[PDB]
Design a protein around this ligand. Structure first.
Ligand SMILES: NC(=O)c1ccc[n+]([C@@H]2O[C@H](COP(=O)([O-])OP(=O)(O)OC[C@H]3O[C@@H](n4cnc5c(N)ncnc54)[C@H](OP(=O)(O)O)[C@@H]3O)[C@@H](O)[C@H]2O)c1
Ligand SMILES: NC(=O)c1ccc[n+]([C@@H]2O[C@H](COP(=O)([O-])OP(=O)(O)OC[C@H]3O[C@@H](n4cnc5c(N)ncnc54)[C@H](OP(=O)(O)O)[C@@H]3O)[C@@H](O)[C@H]2O)c1
Ligand SMILES: NC(=O)c1ccc[n+]([C@@H]2O[C@H](COP(=O)([O-])OP(=O)(O)OC[C@H]3O[C@@H](n4cnc5c(N)ncnc54)[C@H](OP(=O)(O)O)[C@@H]3O)[C@@H](O)[C@H]2O)c1
Ligand SMILES: NC(=O)c1ccc[n+]([C@@H]2O[C@H](COP(=O)([O-])OP(=O)(O)OC[C@H]3O[C@@H](n4cnc5c(N)ncnc54)[C@H](OP(=O)(O)O)[C@@H]3O)[C@@H](O)[C@H]2O)c1
Lengths: 290, 290, 290, 290
């Protein structure tokens, strides 16, 4: 459907984000479009602008949400807007990102070209994490990048067992474990030794965090696999579970973390000019044409 | 169909392979089954046994081929028996392998349990490699593990461009490139930093061989992607292409190597006792149950 | 000097440590030697034994200290006994370690052979870490393995600058930094990608902890270099500094951590049967003789 | 001693090397200095210039040798000019290198500042490699970067044993082994996973080339250690030994390669403006000042 009510999500960061968020406000209101603003960012804006709503509310209000900032800002908007299946459009901070595509100086050219009816709809799946004490459920969180098990208030290594589709893989002693989507394969998992996974791929990568065992290597499994991490019951370690490094749960010795694909996919919007391997060449420095 | 004519493929290695190849000959002839032998191995056998045939011929003769040895012996049989779609059963040398499953001491117990009608049919796809000079074709080879570009008669680094589905990825200076299936993900690609890919996964992993660029990391793409490696035309390097490290082509500056999935899949046979993650725990040393 | 007053240091762990600590008590008292016990371990012992002292006190009382347990138990004793320059002898838990050498079943044979006058004296140097706010000093700690900067109560990456001998190296965004001795090169630094450093080597290795930059590789510098880590002043991150993962300081944005070699070396005692590369072959699984 | 007879060493590469080699010829003859040219490069020069000599002869003729090109050009000149202990000065191709320091546009400014008496003398040690069949010696070669054992005319893995100071380390199956100086630690060894070693460090790094064993990690040993690589006698593999990837020997099953530090050090000349960590920040992309 054509985009009428357009929401805006931003991050309270350097001044340039507040600059582009008003060029976007100007360019969109110029086209006689209703602009609804996030309440968590409208408390510090030029005259606070127009109507104000919350992030869970912005799903059913808006037909499109433009996120200004970087890849990190895209993670928070995705977890809330994927449930409503709202198209999401990302703006850079001048540097090309794996989730943000529009440069602040090409704002009017690329955003207008999307509103005029030339764009690509790409869907990225999220992860569903849930902690359980025997049968009782502690908490359930979503993740677009990764679900990361890591030590909680103790530098000591943690111990756990990995299960994929109820099948025992191994027990391991390490700092933790990174479970990443293709979207998150370029983030923490890449810094921990994991591979790059193309966004077309229906797969999940499991990356050990500095394992005490040198032969512990990343595994890539079917994206429809169900992961089950069992914290060591015979150890006094209380690890932490992080979803996109922003939502944190504290696990008890013996707690079980289940990770699987979320049914609701995030509807990413790109210009037709989008090229995934060009993002890799700029974000990682790969050589260009010979 | 029930297995009647059963072929045998072996490797001219240590004495134990010649030992198990005759226990298999005894156990199979005991069950009143026709045993056909590979000609390349029957030239040195106890009285040369029964009928003798070639590997390309063994496809339409036999209903099942038992390969004794290790994972390396499985690679040669797969490239010839996947075209005929002949079931293949592997025997260990005492140590569990990613392709061979039967231990020489459990030969009669596991092979009989397969012939009695309790087995798993698992299909593994191969790679199709073809070198081209402009339009003319040099050679075309198959690979169950990997297609590897590596330096040819020169320790100097090679230069090349990578294309996936006609889309330019990057140019790179390295020793070479490893393109591996899920089967080959545990071989050379694992030693070069690549991840483990579950056999259920329809994916191909591209691993750079000691790249001059430190940010060159492995990529995992859709298994239906078509890869196109273009040797640097402006360099006096003549690289070599290896298929399972056994079939070698010499590439010219500017030659293009195309790699894609082969339509014919190898029909692997396993006992019901087969567990993939148990192979990883023994081949790599991962910790067992807590 | 010949060893008369012999102290014992242990860890409150599995039952076998309490078993060997009494075979050592029997074997030493059998030889008419004064056995002094650590107070932190004598509170739970068979009748509490003989005299009891503290770890800082055990330096001037004893001529030799036998540490039962593993490599982790050796770290705590080293930081306190290196100031007094007391010889230290380590006992295994059945498995050969990089710091502990005696197997519990060869206790009487190897410990007696050392007391009879056949042993090797090997000295290992420690690290000296000190945090400073401008000029004021927060805390100063020693380390036999490593001084590790890591995130403090925030999964977000930390930012810092590295200085070696007052010379600027680089600024970096990562989980943290591992500064290890040759003793600690096989511990956390090895799991983070660092190299093995022979104990004869006067060198320090600096290993980045999952850096956001892929080209951030470990550096090995002169063991007499002075390291200076400056926490990012323009970031709201409060990192933590760990010495052997046991002593923890919380750093403020802008705090400077100085790391250099400690003058006092730890006097390690080994039997003449000691072989460093045999420890590597067992701890890491390297292949034995062809 | 003040530099009078100044030799020039270049590489037959792109046109710019032939350009700078004549600005250097102009600037030096302008200062009334005798310029002697390498015969292997004077066959294609503007009128062939002045006197012509060989590389082994250029040691006793010249007081200083200026090498134009890159790090690779510095390797060949070092092996021949380190025996004569002739100071060596390197010129860049516009990009800063680990061995070349002068940019072609700062040629007259930096080279003149060295001739005027403001420079640093830094000495880098080389490696001494010698192959032996039992007692007979095949060949002996020097290396400024690395001595590399790698497969010879066979993609199959090679097998060998490592000995350090006559002490057995391990047996290993891999593509090969990289033995690098601090100078070569940033070259092949860095691409194979090795660490950066500061030039002040008296150490040698041993890096396995894609080992079949995942726990085979680089080792850093004393620079005065004597290495002894024994090719597997029970294998039909004929590996090759490369010194700076330019001098090649073919080893037989059972041949022993001995590697140790060469007594003659290469006298490198740098301007006072030289900074080693600035080279790392540009060659590897590390972050600059915060
Ligand atoms: N050592 C590490 O590498 C490390 C440690 C902790 C967390 N992380 C990652 O950080 C994520 C959360 O980021 P945050 O905003 O909360 O702040 P953060 O933990 O400080 O991480 C911010 C950094 O992550 C990058 N990033 C985030 N998602 C990415 C993706 N899909 N591909 C590539 N780079 C990506 C950001 O790129 P922009 O600059 O464009 O935003 C930025 O450089 C986690 O999900 C985790 O994957 C990495
Ligand atoms: N440095 C390296 O790691 C390296 C170098 C060259 C080639 N290779 C691999 O060797 C393969 C060809 O082997 P080859 O028989 O001709 O002799 P080879 O090159 O000497 O390699 C033999 C080794 O490869 C192992 N191997 C083969 N396929 C494997 C798989 N799918 N998963 C795990 N391990 C596997 C074999 O296991 P078994 O002992 O059970 O046979 C054996 O240890 C190539 O396709 C390539 O992947 C690896
Ligand atoms: N992910 C990791 O690899 C990781 C994470 C945190 C800390 N660490 C290391 O743990 C050390 C402190 O150990 P802890 O007793 O307090 O418990 P810990 O953090 O849980 O680490 C205990 C483990 O470290 C091993 N270890 C300790 N020093 C070693 C050395 N020099 N060489 C090889 N292995 C060594 C121990 O061997 P034993 O079983 O023989 O004791 C044991 O396996 C730190 O200094 C740090 O280097 C490693
Ligand atoms: N895959 C690899 O990384 C690989 C493979 C084979 C050989 N090598 C290295 O190449 C060396 C021989 O080089 P070559 O001239 O004969 O041509 P080459 O094998 O094609 O290697 C040339 C490349 O090596 C770089 N290099 C050479 N010495 C270096 C050093 N000390 N630190 C950093 N980079 C260095 C060169 O830098 P410049 O552009 O400034 O010359 C150039 O990028 C060998 O000694 C070996 O270390 C590396």
């Amino acid at each position: 459907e054509p985009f009428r009510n357009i929401g805006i999500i931003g991050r309270l960061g350097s001044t340039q984000v507040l600059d582009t968020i008003r060029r976007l406000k100007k360019f969109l209101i110029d086209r006689h479009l209703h602009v609804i603003l996030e309440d968590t960012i409208a408390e510090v804006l030029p005259g606070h602008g127009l109507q104000t709503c919350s992030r869970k509310i912005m799903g059913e209000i808006c037909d499109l949400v433009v996120v200004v900032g970087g890849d990190g800002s895209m993670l928070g908007a995705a977890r809330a807007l994927a449930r409503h299946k709202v198209p999401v459009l990302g703006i850079n901070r001048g540097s090309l990102g794996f989730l943000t595509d529009i440069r602040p100086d090409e704002l009017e050219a690329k955003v207008g070209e999307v509103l005029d009816g030339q764009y690509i709809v790409e869907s990225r799946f999220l992860l569903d994490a849930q902690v359980r004490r025997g049968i009782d459920s502690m908490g359930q969180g979503d993740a677009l990048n990764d679900v990361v098990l890591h030590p909680g208030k103790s530098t000591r290594m943690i111990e756990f067992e990995l299960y994929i589709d109820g099948q025992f893989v191994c027990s391991q002693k390490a700092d933790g474990l990174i479970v990443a989507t293709p979207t998150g394969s370029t983030a923490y998992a890449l810094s921990a030794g994991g591979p790059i996974m193309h966004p077309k791929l229906d797969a999940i990568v499991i990356v050990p965090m500095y394992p005490h065992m040198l032969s512990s290597r990343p595994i890539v499994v079917d994206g429809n696999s169900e992961l089950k991490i069992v914290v060591s019951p015979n150890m006094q370690i209380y690890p932490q579970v992080s979803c996109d490094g922003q939502n944190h749960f504290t696990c008890a010795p013996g707690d079980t973390v289940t990770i699987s694909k979320k049914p609701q996919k995030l509807r990413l919007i790109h210009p037709i000019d989008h090229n995934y391997y060009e993002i890799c060449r700029t974000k990682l420095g790969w050589g260009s044409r010979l």
